[PDB]
From a paper:
Members of the [name]/[name] family ([name]–KDM4E) catalyze the removal of an Nε-methyl group from Nε-methyl-lysine residues and belong to dioxygenases with α-ketoglutarate (α-KG) and Fe(II) as cofactors. [name], KDM4B, and KDM4C share a similar domain structure (JmjN, JmjC, two plant homeodomains, and two Tudor domains), while KDM4D and KDM4E lack the C-terminal domains (plant homeodomain and Tudor). [name]‒KDM4C members act on two histone methyl marks, i.e., histone 3 lysine 9 trimethylation/dimethylation (H3K9me3/me2) and histone 3 lysine 36 trimethylation/dimethylation (H3K36me3/me2), whereas KDM4D and KDM4E only demethylate H3K9me3/me2. By demethylating H3K9me3, a repressive mark enriched in heterochromatin, [name]–KDM4C function to coactivate AR in the case of PCa, releasing the transcriptional block and promoting tumor progression.
We next performed molecular docking to build a KDM4B⋅myricetin complex model using BIOVIA, Discovery Studio (CDOCKER) since we were not able to obtain well diffracting myricetin-liganded [name] crystals. We further evaluated the inhibitory effects of analogues based on three separate parts of myricetin: (4-phenylpiperazine-1-yl) (phenyl) methanone, (E)-N'-(benzylidene) isonicotinohydrazide, and pyrocatechol. Among those, BPRKD63S0 (3,4-dihydroxybenzoic acid; 63S0) which belongs to an analogue of the pyrocatechol exhibited the highest inhibitory effect (560 nM). Additionally, we have determined the [name]⋅63S0 complex structure in which 63S0 is a pyrocatechol analogue. The inhibitor 63S0 coordinates the metal ion with two hydroxyl groups and makes two H bonds with Tyr132, Lys206. Superposition of the [name]⋅63S0 crystal structure and the KDM4B⋅ myricetin model revealed the same β-jellyroll structural fold. Additionally, 63S0 and the pyrocatechol moiety of myricetin share overlapped surrounding residues in the α-KG-binding site, consistent with a highly conserved active-site framework seen for the structures of [name]‒C. These results collectively suggest myricetin interacts with the metal-binding site and serves as a potent α-KG-type inhibitor that blocks KDM4s. A Lineweaver–Burk plot demonstrated myricetin competes with α-KG for binding to the active site (Ki = 0.21 μM for [name], 0.53 μM for KDM4B, and 0.15 μM for KDM4C). Of note, 63S0 coordinates the metal ion and makes H bonds with Tyr132, Lys206 in the α-KG-binding region of the catalytic pocket. These results collectively suggest myricetin is bound at the center of the active site and functions as a potent α-KG-type inhibitor that blocks the demethylation activity by KDM4s.
Author numbering:
A (entry chain A), B (entry chain A): 8 to 347
Amino acid sequence: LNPSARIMTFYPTMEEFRNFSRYIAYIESQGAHRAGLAKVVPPKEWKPRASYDDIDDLVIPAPIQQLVTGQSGLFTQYNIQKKAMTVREFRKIANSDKYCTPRYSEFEELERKYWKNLTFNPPIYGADVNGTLYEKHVDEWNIGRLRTILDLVEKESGITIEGVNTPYLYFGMWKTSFAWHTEDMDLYSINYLHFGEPKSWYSVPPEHGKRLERLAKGFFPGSAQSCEAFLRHKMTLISPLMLKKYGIPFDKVTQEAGEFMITFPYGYHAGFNHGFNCAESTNFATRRWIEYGKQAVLCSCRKDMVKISMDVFVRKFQPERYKLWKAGKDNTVIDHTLPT
Amino acid sequence: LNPSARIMTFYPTMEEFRNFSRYIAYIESQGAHRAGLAKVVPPKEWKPRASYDDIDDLVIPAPIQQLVTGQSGLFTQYNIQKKAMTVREFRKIANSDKYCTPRYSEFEELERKYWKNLTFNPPIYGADVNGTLYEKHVDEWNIGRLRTILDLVEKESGITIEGVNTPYLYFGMWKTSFAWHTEDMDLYSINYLHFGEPKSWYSVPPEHGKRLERLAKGFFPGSAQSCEAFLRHKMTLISPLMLKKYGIPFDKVTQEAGEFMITFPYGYHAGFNHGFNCAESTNFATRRWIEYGKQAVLCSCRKDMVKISMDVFVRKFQPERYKLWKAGKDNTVIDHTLPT
Ligand SMILES: [Cl-]
Ligand SMILES: [Cl-]
Ligand code: NI
Ligand code: NI
Ligand SMILES: [Zn+2]
Ligand SMILES: [Zn+2]
């Protein structure tokens, strides 16, 4: 099931959509997770918010400017912090003549332009904004309260991790980028594009993640020297042309307003925004993730970084192996194809 | 005198060198200041310091990484702050295989390389380090105590301005850059290259500064919109090929270890380091500067920036015009050619 590991798109009915957990399992039962990434277009009956008319006053505390250096499809992205601005201010710049989306025909033409011009004209990205655009009445696919077993991190340790077990908003503009990475603790993510122009994504099947890690280490050995998980710094950009060249399998998908994307444990993704827009994301967990989390290779090289204790998930959901794992003796092998 | 406004080099004897003020006047009497920049190679009898063997332990608190974006000779340079390192650490990186000076023949070949590669491989620059490498016994050309009338800023207002009336050290490496600018308040500067590889400079005659300002505003109108003195942000790099093209006259000069450079009021300069090195600089003033300082166009757009009060210099050195200037009625025109 999903032999080719292509990115699947799903159209749940309202009835299916009302159960989050079951639907994630369903799409895994269809092999969605093999591609690393899937699209879910929600039922038309559903709406996260009445309208987006009342948010120009919303404050993006820490926009960042994306400076990118490199050539022939390899690049590194440095984030310069800029001062507080409002969505109103952000929108004016995004729509301004210097920063706005070029004219184009097919997405293939806009994609060529992103890669020929990513080093020029650094854009602002209103990233990592704490908050949510969902009205409180909304019970389905509400990113602020999915009620997955990730909630055990908070319930048992009083711990908050911004953007991991709380929601983040991302205001974008043409050519703002997200670099190749997997999620914190190789968790799942969910991303909803509330409005505006598209966000294109690239994904590599989890069963080929190690081959992308290997290639990255080749091209950036110094970065590989000082961190094992350097891709987790989210600074590394690699062209699809580079990926074909070193035979890394990958797929591409464009997300439009009103659509969800789900990323799956150890699914490497990257991409960029087409123009002004607003996405909302968080991380979540399932019982299948637990193994991935026990085995996730973390960033050593910074003290900021996200470490979740696996003790509570193994204690409850893998009792048969708890003592074994506790003693360094749990040698489970992950099969990335299983829908477990 | 100096019709062509070329960068002059001077070889003072020890006897001439012992009087700083007089020697600056002498070189101005030869028209050195018309080029904006002059070299002074000091008498061999003189040495700022016995040796530079005891400074690996010296701490550079705020190295910065120089990210540069642009193309066909126009660029903007953003400074990412990195963590504390020692000269020892700095030296290892500077000398490392990824960061070190390419092999080359003539400087013309190394200059081509700086401009073809300035956007790649961002280097660290151990800039703006408070301190001095001069032994205390040294009375000539001692950057920490030139005793110019700039000392009135401190004596009358208790004011310290790091790198302006105190010394700064600059540890460099291949391809670290200083962008087109004039000094704070269009003051004079002095730069001494204590050791290591060269530092190349570009200069534009003060009598053609407005033409470079004009060209800059053309190429960066947005930056020109929000600041009048945007070049003062020290972010703007412009190729010599661009300067020929728009007919801005300029000259180039390479400074080697043990040599001083002097910049003159309203002399636009820029350049770069050839490899690992260490320069020391500060600003100074003469009576000729006072007019330039009364008329200097400042950065509006940041509250950090350097504003020196001219009151005390006009009061003492232009008493005939004090009341007039006080009342908005002093309409002196600067002649950049005069040695005044
Ligand atoms: Cl590297
Ligand atoms: Cl501009
Ligand atoms: Ni992510
Ligand atoms: Ni300067
Ligand atoms: Zn790391
Ligand atoms: Zn300014």
